[PDB]
Structure to design on (1741 residues):
């Protein structure tokens, strides 16, 4: 009851009465005594002393406040921070938060590569105007790159960073290349040998057939994947030998599978899996796809496909003296059994360099060709479209961005509703003072916002909104906020039905009167503002009482009244069977109860 | 339709889903008890794992003394546990380890432990899980029994003015020879033999709280006399385990992963292309019923052989104190009639008086031990039941692992690994799928030579990539931990300004050890906040609660505007997040709390981590 | 300076020593001068290795076997409350009456309880008369606005049925007294073994479903954010909470929470007294009858009542007793419902949509009576049910980062909406669902762990790990090797009794190894 101990003179000197409001507080004492002491008690000024004594803790807080938070990225492994290393970097993730150092180049590289990917994808919407629409997009795209407002017609060239998108977009500019290749996300290069194209067939389901191409001669390459080097030689649709010097399980597995596809080694180039027959669609929406990229995509779906591909490659039992340079199905550095024609080692294979620049030729599908075919890049080797917010950018030509969503549609509708006010005749305040609400049910803006409304039960929404509008207009008691909130629904015709307390749009969102919400919120002491997803909007007018009267914006045929606990709690349905002079409590929100009376 | 929540283990790993196998951390509702049945089976299995039959009546009790050390017999069926130790091999392994690490290694460690002890205050003994009072004959925290002991010394032969560990130990020693000793009771005194026994008494505690396995049904609970010597020995063993690469006891997590990967990489860089290694997840069984303090004593002697005789004699205290340890038998058996309408209750000391009534199972487990009983306890002359000397056991295990000879070298094979207290992971090396078996058998033999056994139904092995250690399921990658700890307010209530900060620090730590992730940490935070509130019966102001503390808060609230600055204990709301855990909420709301409220809270002229006006003395 | 020595200590030290040495000095001299002779040591270890026969199996030539389960009657229901066969009356929530004593009285006012009048003869039970008279007394007490029960005849009985008897002092004992009373050592009973339950799957499925109402479990707020990390964490937590709250498992969790919160207070403020406590829960939103979208609806629900016996929580490891009177609209089955005494209490009403209106269809009503005990530790363990989520959240997040790290980009939504996980077999064929839908299974598993927690479950979970690791090694073509599998099988079979969760898990594990045999080579059929 009074387990907590206290002092006596310290209590009387503060004049702490027991049972202040039936709370004893107490030598012994309760816990509420601390609340009574901190809410009504003596006043000191010891802030400076406290800060000085707790200097270390408050300096830690200061340091924390002295941070410029940066982005984060999911990845792996190939003092003042120790206080925060827990929140700075784990093992799968990491945050690039910095303190004082600034250098904006690699982020600029990421931005430019992302936008190049974006534009090159956008140009993949026709069959004939590929290069034209591409170049015109480029010419209509400028950026505040770093600190300089530059255009995207010189950055692609001035930059030196190999990538499928950079090359695919620069070839159209007759720009210099570096003899580098891109088969999917992997990076390849030639070392010696040469050959010519040759065609062959492959079955699907055991009946059909499809043509693919390859090379018949011997040729050595230098594969390379994330944290994984390699070297290998392809001969007659099959992989002869290969070696690796970057030790990781997943990286090595994926790199090996990609190099095998590049060599088309394996039986799945004779027949196809039973999963492909489920589709047999080596085609885009309206375009064609080779077999290699289809196989790759089939790999990306699940690692079981990768394991199956690798099993297609012969597996054998390792012999002595080779464990150190053997491999396993899961990338294991050494094993008692390994795969045929493999060699593991340590140390990344030093990559060669080609100092010979060239220019390629784009095709209908934008595939570039330097010579003897030998595709260097394409859109097929790109990721799927990934929406990302772009800043420091200007994109003027059509196809720049859809920039059309239900959220933005509603935002613009509400902006129009707000501007319509216009502090003039034939606008909201004039019709209010005139008590002509029927015209409100015919404005253009509500007609533009109507499509955003849930169609199945729009009649009841319109009924309720018109009820509220008329009840607030006729009497003259109203609140512009809730009115504008419900107006978009006062267009269609009213009907009978069951209402619940929320008005649903077509995007599964909703709005509710007498409450605030992300889509629409407002509060007093800032009534000149209306938030929309946090976007503060302004009112072309000023009001101090036009909103203060919300007694009719909560329910339809009721009005708020003084609080009374005796009144029984009810729902929105039983309301129909109520009478007059009969108060009733009811929830108006989350843990928000209010009393109401009819009329 | 049917269900099987294991099919997700086929197309996925195990390091990602293993957590779903064990329940969430917390206090075990099993109520693992310590009953007379349990106390007696343990003693039997102890005397049995001793494969000898020799004895020697003492002179201080007139009682036999099963000497199970350096007298191995009953070689048959030796795959089962053993406790008979060989001193020669033990000292040989110690010498190997010394040679490896260095000559003046043990000397340096013992010197460090000494100097650390010198400036130590006996008051440190107050920091302990629990102990056993030798006056009230119960279990309590260390501070209570310490106060009891000091006030008894005061009442009997004047106060203890040492204020240091060494004077405390010497005072205990002197008290071992006192004939009469006094203490306040319900006052009473006792003689020499009874006080000796009480000091050498031990009680079985039922508490066993941890993850993994709660095999600590009868965890020991010693008194206070032996406490400081045990602390000294543990300090020395710790100073030793730090320099050892294969010692994951003193710390875990980041450092543990570092050790793991260092070991693995050194291995990979050590052997050749012809050799192929293997791993084994081992789990020593009966790590408490096969550790003998006599071997520990000989080992400590060999260690301190070249050092101050002070430490030589000191380190030789706790061992002998464990060579003679009376064990308090739990609550006695109970009788009952047929219909069970009547039920007698009897203590342990009198079960030897009604041995005729008891059922055959209890009867065949009690007579052979009646010899060692004195009044109600059992004179256990060895073993090691407490969770003590864990550092020392780990040192012995590392000694086992640092072995190497020429018989192996000739075959081109070897081993290495890591060992916790009673759990380990081995990495063998060879160039044939058979010599591996020979090496494993050699290792098991050398381990059994000194009582360190291994389980067969809980110890497995496979290729090097996969293993487990202390719930940290290692794999080629994706090292997954499972040691997610949490606080508990109801059991440990301190103040409304410390528990929350402590929980934040705990969550931060768990995140460091990778046992927690951002979203998981945030969920745990929002859960612990509610637990705290419900504990101290507090809620925010937005809520429509009617509790006592809220009444006043429901009226003195409108007088403030900085609701954000309010304290959680006073209708407050959270403002700390991941990047603001080390920062207490107070430091985070100081500049924001209303001047009046800030001052009402920060008033050293009050009747009572940032020292708040929220304490519950 | 030196440790001043006594005498008894020195005598002991000289006594307690190894065999060949009888004084601390001889042993000390032997130690300080111990020299290394690796040859004798090698010979000794070789001799030990010879007289030891350590077997080493590889799980391939000598595979595992299916587990032999116990035999006998089916395992019955064990949890305190009812999950799937339950039923609850509803009413609107008043923040001014948000307490058990008030909610129960309000529910009683409208007189729907007084209409509950169970007939004399039950369907299956043991002590129907006691339960009936106790129900009448409960209604009487509620009428009196006091939850207390003065008369102690039924509660006393039902609390003493476990154990109650006299006690004779040992000093008042002789041999003739013994021979007269035939006193003996109290034989200790063992739990009887049971068979595999054939109703666990139904309860699991029902729990996986989505409840009409939502908001059963309360939660705290969300603090501010200062970077992308906290934003991502908050987004993930909100997603998981919005997905889980709509289930039925959450209903049971909130019910247990709110009932234990009252029982822990009644055992504290009214110990040694008989009180009445409701079994209630609180919701905050439902789904429209015209639309599948959420709608705010704060409401209270009453599944049943729980009476309390004398509870001090300081003796007998704090064991106390309770009695449950739960409502149901589903007749029982003899096997699953063995510890329950059942009645038939008139009828009730069910309400369902009809176009734009609501209707009501009358149905029968049943009353499930049962007795059971509890403790303080069980209260502390149940009150902390929310922690389940934390484990479910961790299962969701390990998966949403690993992948995100392999590709080095946010794949949270992609994996949640695409990554398929096997959940079960239908018509002899596997079934898969997205992670967003398997969260429910994970949470139900954690919950059932929290309920049936016991030593048996501890052993089962501690042992299955070895099988799981062996299987994983099998998948990746690794010659897993052991020492005595059959011993482990026995260790696992010995801990299988009167706990349906362990039996269900064992059966599913056998089925798993069977299905994997199609791709593994370490298991029999």
């Amino acid at each position: 009851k009074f387990p907590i101990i206290a002092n006596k003179r310290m209590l009387e000197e503060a004049q702490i009465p027991k049972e202040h409001n039936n709370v004893a507080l107490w030598v012994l004492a309760s816990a509420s005594c601390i609340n009574y002491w901190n809410f009504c008690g003596p006043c000191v000024n010891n802030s400076e002393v406290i800060k000085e004594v707790y200097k270390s803790r408050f300096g830690r807080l200061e340091r924390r406040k002295e941070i410029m938070w940066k982005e984060l990225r999911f990845t792996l492994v190939d003092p003042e921070r120790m206080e925060l290393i827990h929140a700075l970097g784990g093992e799968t993730w990491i945050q690039e938060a910095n303190t004082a150092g600034i250098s904006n180049v690699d982020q600029r590289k990421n931005d430019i590569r992302a936008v190049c990917r974006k534009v090159c994808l956008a140009a993949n919407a026709s069959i004939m105007n590929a290069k034209s629409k591409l170049v015109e997009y480029i010419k209509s795209t400028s950026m505040r790159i770093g600190e300089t407002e530059r255009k995207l017609e010189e950055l692609i060239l001035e930059t030196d960073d190999v990538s499928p998108e950079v090359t695919l977009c620069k070839s159209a500019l007759g720009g210099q290349l570096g003899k580098t290749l891109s088969f999917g996300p992997m990076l390849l290069k030639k070392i010696s040998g040469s050959g010519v194209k040759v065609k062959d067939t492959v079955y699907i389901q055991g009946v059909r057939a499809v043509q693919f191409e390859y090379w018949s001669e011997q040729e050595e390459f230098y594969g390379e994947y994330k944290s994984a080097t390699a070297l290998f030689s392809r001969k007659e649709r099959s992989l002869e030998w290969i070696t690796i010097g970057g030790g990781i399980n997943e990286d090595r597995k994926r790199l090996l599978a990609m190099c095998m596809i590049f060599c088309r080694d394996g039986d799945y180039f004779k027949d196809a899996p039973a999963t492909i027959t489920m589709a047999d669609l080596s085609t885009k929406l309206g375009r064609e796809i080779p077999y290699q990229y289809v196989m790759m995509n089939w790999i990306q779906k699940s690692e079981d496909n990768l394991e199956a591909l690798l099993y297609s490659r012969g597996i054998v039992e390792t012999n002595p003296g080779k464990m150190g340079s053997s491999m396993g199905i899961d990338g294991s550095k050494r094993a008692i059994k390994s795969l045929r024609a493999v060699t593991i080692q340590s140390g990344k294979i030093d990559m060669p360099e080609s100092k010979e620049k060239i220019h390629l030729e784009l095709s209908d599908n934008l595939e570039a060709f330097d010579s003897s075919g030998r595709i260097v890049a394409t859109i097929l080797d790109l990721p799927s479209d990934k929406k990302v917010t772009f800043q420091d950018v200007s994109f003027q030509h059509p196809d720049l961005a859809v920039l059309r969503d239900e959220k933005t549609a509603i935002t613009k509708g509400y902006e129009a509703l707000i501007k319509r006010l216009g502090t003039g005749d034939n606008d909201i305040p004039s019709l209010i003072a005139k008590k002509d609400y029927l015209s409100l049910y015919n404005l253009p803006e509500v007609k533009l916002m109507a499509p955003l409304i849930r169609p199945n039960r729009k009649g009841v929404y319109s009924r309720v909104a018109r009820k509220l509008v008329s009840t607030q207009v006729t009497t003259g008691h109203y609140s512009l906020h809730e009115l504008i909130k419900v107006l978009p629904f006062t267009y269609f015709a009213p009907k009978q039905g069951m209402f619940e307390g929320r008005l649903f749009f077509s995007n599964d969102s909703f709005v509710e009167p007498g409450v605030n919400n992300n889509v629409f919120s407002w509060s007093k002491a800032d009534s000149s503002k209306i938030y929309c997803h946090g976007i503060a909007i302004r009112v072309p007018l000023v009001v101090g009482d036009e909103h203060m009267d919300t007694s009719l914006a909560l329910l339809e045929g009721f009005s708020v009244c003084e609080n009374d606990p005796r009144a029984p709690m009810v729902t929105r349905q039983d309301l129909i069977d109520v009478g007059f002079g009969q108060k009733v409590r009811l929830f108006v929100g989350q843990g928000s109860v209010r009393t109401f009376k009819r009329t | 339709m049917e269900i099987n929540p294991y099919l997700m283990f086929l197309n996925n790993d195990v390091t990602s889903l293993i957590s779903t196998t064990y329940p969430y951390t917390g206090p075990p509702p099993m109520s693992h008890g310590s009953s007379t049945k349990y106390t007696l089976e343990t003693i039997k299995r102890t005397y049995d794992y001793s494969r000898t039959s020799v004895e020697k009546t003492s002179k201080v009790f007139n009682i036999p003394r099963r000497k199970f050390c350096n007298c191995l017999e009953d070689k048959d069926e030796l795959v089962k546990p053993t406790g008979n130790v060989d001193i020669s091999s033990l000292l040989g392994l110690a010498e190997m380890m010394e040679k490896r690490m260095g000559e003046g290694f043990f000397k340096h460690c013992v010197m460090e432990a000494e100097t650390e002890i010198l400036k130590m205050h006996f008051s440190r003994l107050t920091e302990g899980r629990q102990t056993y009072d030798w006056t009230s004959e119960r279990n309590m925290p260390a501070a209570t029994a310490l106060q009891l002991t000091v006030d008894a010394i005061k009442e009997t032969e004047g106060p203890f003015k040492g204020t240091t560990m060494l004077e405390y130990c010497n005072k205990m020693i002197e008290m071992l020879d006192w004939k009469e000793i006094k203490f306040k009771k319900v006052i009473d005194s006792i003689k020499h033999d009874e006080f000796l026994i009480r000091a050498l008494t031990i009680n079985t505690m039922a508490k066993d709280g941890e993850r993994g396995k709660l095999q600590r049904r009868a965890i020991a609970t010693p008194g206070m006399i032996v406490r400081p010597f045990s602390k000294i020995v543990e300090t020395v063993a710790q100073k030793i385990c730090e320099k050892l690469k294969e010692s994951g006891l003193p710390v875990g997590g980041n450092e543990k992963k570092a050790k793991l990967k260092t070991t693995v990489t050194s291995l990979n860089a050590r052997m050749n292309s012809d050799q192929f290694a293997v791993n084994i997840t081992g789990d020593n069984s009966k790590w408490n019923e096969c550790q003998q303090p006599e071997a520990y004593l000989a080992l400590l002697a060999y260690i301190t052989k070249d050092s101050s005789d002070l430490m030589k004699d000191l380190c030789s205290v706790a061992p002998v104190l464990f060579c003679n340890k009376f064990v308090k038998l739990g609550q006695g058996i109970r009788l009952s009639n047929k219909r069970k309408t009547k039920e007698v209750i009897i203590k342990a000391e009198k079960m030897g008086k009604y041995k005729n009534l008891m059922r055959e199972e209890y009867k065949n487990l009690f007579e052979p031990l009646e010899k060692y009983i004195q009044k109600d306890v059992c004179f256990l002359p060895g073993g090691m039941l407490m969770g003590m000397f864990n550092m020392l056991s780990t040192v012995l295990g590392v000694s086992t692992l640092c072995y190497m000879d020429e018989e192996l070298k000739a075959k081109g094979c070897f081993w290495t690994g890591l060992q916790s207290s009673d759990d380990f992971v081995l990495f063998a090396v060879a160039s044939n799928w058979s010599n591996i078996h020979w090496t494993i058998r050699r290792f098991n033999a050398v381990c059994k030579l000194i009582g360190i056994n291994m389980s067969l139904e809980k110890s497995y092995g496979s290729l090097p990539e996969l293993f487990e250690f202390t719930s940290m399921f290692f794999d080629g990658e994706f090292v997954s931990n499972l040691a997610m700890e949490l606080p508990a307010f109801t059991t440990a209530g301190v103040n409304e300004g410390v528990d929350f900060t402590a929980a934040m620090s705990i969550i931060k730590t768990n995140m460091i050890n990778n046992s927690l992730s951002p979203s998981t940490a945030l969920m745990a935070l929002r859960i612990c906040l509610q637990e705290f509130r419900a504990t101290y019966r507090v809620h925010p102001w937005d809520s429509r609660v009617k509790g006592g503390r809220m009444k006043i808060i429901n009226e003195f609230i409108k007088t403030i505007e900085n609701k954000d600055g309010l304290l959680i204990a006073d209708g407050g709301k959270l403002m700390n997040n991941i990047s603001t855990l080390h920062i207490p909420e107070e430091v985070l709301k100081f500049e924001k709390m209303d001047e009046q409220y800030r001052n009402r809270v920060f008033n050293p002229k009050n009747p009572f981590a940032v020292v708040s006006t929220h304490s519950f003395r | 300076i030196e440790m001043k020595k006594g005498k008894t200590f020195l005598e002991l030290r000289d006594e307690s020593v190894p065999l060949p040495f009888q004084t601390y000095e001889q042993m000390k001299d032997y130690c300080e001068k111990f020299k290394g002779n690796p040859r004798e040591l090698a010979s000794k270890v070789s001799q030990m290795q010879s007289n030891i026969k350590l077997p080493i199996k590889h799980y391939e030539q000598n595979k595992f076997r299916q587990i032999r389960l116990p035999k006998g009657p089916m395992a019955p229901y064990t949890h305190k409350f009812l999950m799937e066969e339950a039923w609850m009356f509803t009413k609107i929530s008043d923040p001014e009456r948000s307490r058990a004593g008030e909610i129960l009285i309000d529910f009683f006012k409208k007189g729907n309880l007084s209409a509950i009048r169970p007939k004399d003869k039950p369907l299956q039970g043991k002590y129907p008369i006691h339960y009936k008279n106790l129900w009448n007394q409960i209604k009487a007490a509620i009428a009196d606005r006091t939850m207390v029960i003065n008369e102690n005849d039924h509660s006393e009985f039902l609390g003493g049925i476990g154990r109650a008897s006299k006690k004779i002092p040992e000093i008042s004992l002789t041999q003739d007294v013994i021979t007269t009373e035939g006193l003996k050592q109290s034989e200790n009973k063992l739990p009887e073994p049971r068979s595999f339950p054939r109703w666990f799957n139904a309860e699991w499925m029902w729990a996986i479903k989505d409840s009409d109402l939502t908001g059963w479990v309360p939660m705290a707020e969300y603090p501010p954010a200062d970077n992308e990390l906290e934003d991502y964490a908050e987004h993930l937590n909100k997603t998981m909470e919005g997905v889980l709250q709509g289930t039925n498992c959450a209903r049971e969790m909130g019910k247990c929470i709110l009932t234990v919160g009252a029982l822990m207070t009644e055992c504290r403020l009214f110990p040694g007294k008989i009180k009445v406590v409701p079994i209630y829960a609180r919701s905050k939103e439902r789904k429209s009858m015209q639309e599948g979208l959420p709608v705010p609806s704060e409401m209270d629900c009453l599944f049943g009542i729980c009476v309390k016996s004398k509870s001090h929580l300081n003796k007998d490891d704090g064991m106390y007793t309770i009695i449950t009177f739960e409502f149901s609209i589903r007749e029982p089955n003899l096997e699953k419902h063995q510890k329950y005494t059942v009645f038939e209490a008139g009828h009730t009403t069910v309400r369902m949509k009809k176009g734009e209106s609501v209707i009501g269809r009358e149905v029968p009503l049943y009353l499930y009576c049962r007795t059971t005990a509890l403790s303080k530790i069980k209260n502390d363990w149940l009150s902390k049910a929310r922690r389940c989520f934390i484990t479910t959240m961790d299962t969701v997040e390990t998966i949403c980062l690993r992948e995100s790290a392999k590709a080095e980009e946010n794949l949270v939504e992609k994996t949640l909406n695409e990554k398929q996980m096997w959940i079960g077999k239908k018509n002899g064929e596997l079934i898969a669902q997205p992670l967003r839908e398997a969260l429910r299974v994970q949470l139900v598993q954690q919950f059932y762990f929290c309920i049936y927690n016991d030593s048996q479950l501890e052993g089962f979970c501690n042992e299955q790990k070895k099988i799981l690791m062996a299987l994983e090694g099998d998948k990746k073509n690794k010659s897993s090797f052991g020492f005595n599998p059959e011993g482990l099988l026995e260790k696992i079979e010995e801990c299988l009794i009167n706990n349906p969760m362990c039996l269900f898990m064992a059966q599913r594990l056998n089925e798993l190894v069977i299905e994997a045999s199609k791709r593994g080579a370490k298991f029999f059929k």
Notes: Chain A has 18 helices and 24 strands. The two ends of chain A are 51 Å apart (CA to CA).
